[PDB]
Amino acid sequence: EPSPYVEFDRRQWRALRMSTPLALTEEELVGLRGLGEQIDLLEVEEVYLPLARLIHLQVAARQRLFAATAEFLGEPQQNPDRPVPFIIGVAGSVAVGKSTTARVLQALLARWDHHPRVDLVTTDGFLYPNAELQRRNLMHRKGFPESYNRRALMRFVTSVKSGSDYACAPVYSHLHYDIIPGAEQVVRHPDILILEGLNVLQTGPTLMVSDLFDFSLYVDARIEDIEQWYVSRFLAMRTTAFADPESHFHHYAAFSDSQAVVAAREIWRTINRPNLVENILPTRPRATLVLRKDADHSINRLRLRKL
């Protein structure tokens, strides 16, 4: 039966790498990966290099599109020193590795032969402040679509892809578990813009940020493996992030393996899992490329949208 997708195993996919240069050291990859991630230069060579190739093949191809509409509208050319920004979305569950994935993707694309301006924005900074969340009785649905100012987010991405000289996004603090007063992330007409977050691929009654994506990525894995990673990582954070007295969750540092596991499973069950099942997973069908990870965080299978 005909299909919009085309599956791959790491073997089939690593061949499409061709002669793409690996411009990332071991020290660099390290500072890009998160606690728990297993990503190594090998995976970066057999998976991220092909992806980066495909993306650049499409950055140019995509420009042909806006160019047509430009020609149709009888308008000028485009300052080649300012084309239409290529927007990439990276979606996935909490703890599946998407943040690392987006950080690595930005590193590789920015180090491309001509040195493109590659900006990365996480939807964290678009969550509503804790105070505003409490007001809406949402302090327990942090990460759900409604916990974000999707309007500000949409204005942000629209602003950037429309050619603005610069746009601003709030900044979120994982240490304080809240939006930081007065903080700003300024993005100035980048060549590429990667947007990473839980529900970026979301679709709805209004034009949304996913409708502005020229390419999308969905980091996938089994719901139980992600729970495992989540829990495991919660325990690990007792000696890293929670160890810090300034941490909103410093109280967690003193938890025992047992009580920490229980606490982690509860947050997963009451928050992260529901959101994954109800909002995130339903968006997967639309991803240009899905990176499937095995229980060991290893990306061994990919699903690409040819249609």
* Partner from a copy of itself, Na ion, none contacting 3, C-beta within 5 to 8 A by type: a copy of itself
Q: How far is the CB of 288 from a copy of itself (least distance, A)?
A: 9
**Residue (35 or 207) nearer to a copy of itself, CB:** 207
Q: How far is the CB of 275 from a copy of itself (least distance, A)?
A: 15
**Is 290 labelled a binding residue?**
no
Cβ within 8 Å of residue 73, ≥6 positions away = none
Contact between 142 and 270 (Cβ < 8 Å): no
Contacts 24+ apart (CB under 8 A), 67-74: none
**Residue (41 or 236) nearer to Na ion, CB:** 236
- Please give the residue ranges that form the binding site for Na ion (CB under 5 A): 99, 122, 124
- In the chain, the largest separation of any two C-alpha atoms, in whole Å, equals 68
Q: How far is the CB of 57 from a copy of itself (least distance, A)?
A: 4
**Residue (8 or 255) nearer to a copy of itself, CB:** 8
**Is 97 labelled a binding residue?**
yes
* Partner from a copy of itself, Na ion, none contacting 159, C-beta within 5 to 8 A by type: a copy of itself
**Is 96 labelled a binding residue?**
yes
103, amino acid identity: R
* Partner from Na ion, a copy of itself, none contacting 53, C-beta within 5 to 8 A by type: a copy of itself
* Partner from a copy of itself, Na ion, none contacting 115, C-beta within 5 to 8 A by type: none
Q: Tell me the pairing of strands 289-293 and 118-122.
A: unpaired
* Partner from a copy of itself, Na ion, none contacting 122, C-beta within 5 to 8 A by type: Na ion
**Is 36 labelled a binding residue?**
no
Q: Locate 162 and state its tokens.
A: 């429309």
Q: How far is the CB of 25 from a copy of itself (least distance, A)?
A: 26
DSSP string, 115-133: ---EEEEEGGGGBPPHHHH
Contact between 216 and 210 (Cβ < 8 Å): yes
Q: How far is the CB of 207 from a copy of itself (least distance, A)?
A: 4
**Is 93 labelled a binding residue?**
yes
Q: If we measure between CA atoms, which residue out of 120, 289, 305, 144 comes closest to residue 220?
A: 289
Q: How far is the CB of 232 from a copy of itself (least distance, A)?
A: 30
* Partner from a copy of itself, Na ion, none contacting 211, C-beta within 5 to 8 A by type: a copy of itself
- Please give the residue ranges that form the binding site for a copy of itself (CB under 8 A): 1-4, 6, 15-16, 18, 53-54, 57-58, 60-62, 64-69, 71-74, 155, 158-159, 161-162, 164, 203-207, 211-212, 282, 285-286, 304, 306-307
Q: Tell me the pairing of strands 192-196 and 86-92.
A: parallel
Which residue's CB comes closest to Na ion?
Answer: 122
Q: Where are the alpha helices (DSSP H) in the chain?
A: 10-14, 26-30, 41-43, 49-72, 98-110, 130-135, 150-161, 223-236, 257-267, 273-275
**Is 98 labelled a binding residue?**
yes
The phi, psi pair for 93, rounded to 5°, reads: -70, 165
Q: Where are the alpha helices (DSSP H) in 73-199?
A: 98-110, 130-135, 150-161
Binding residues: 92-99
Binding residues for ATP: 92-99
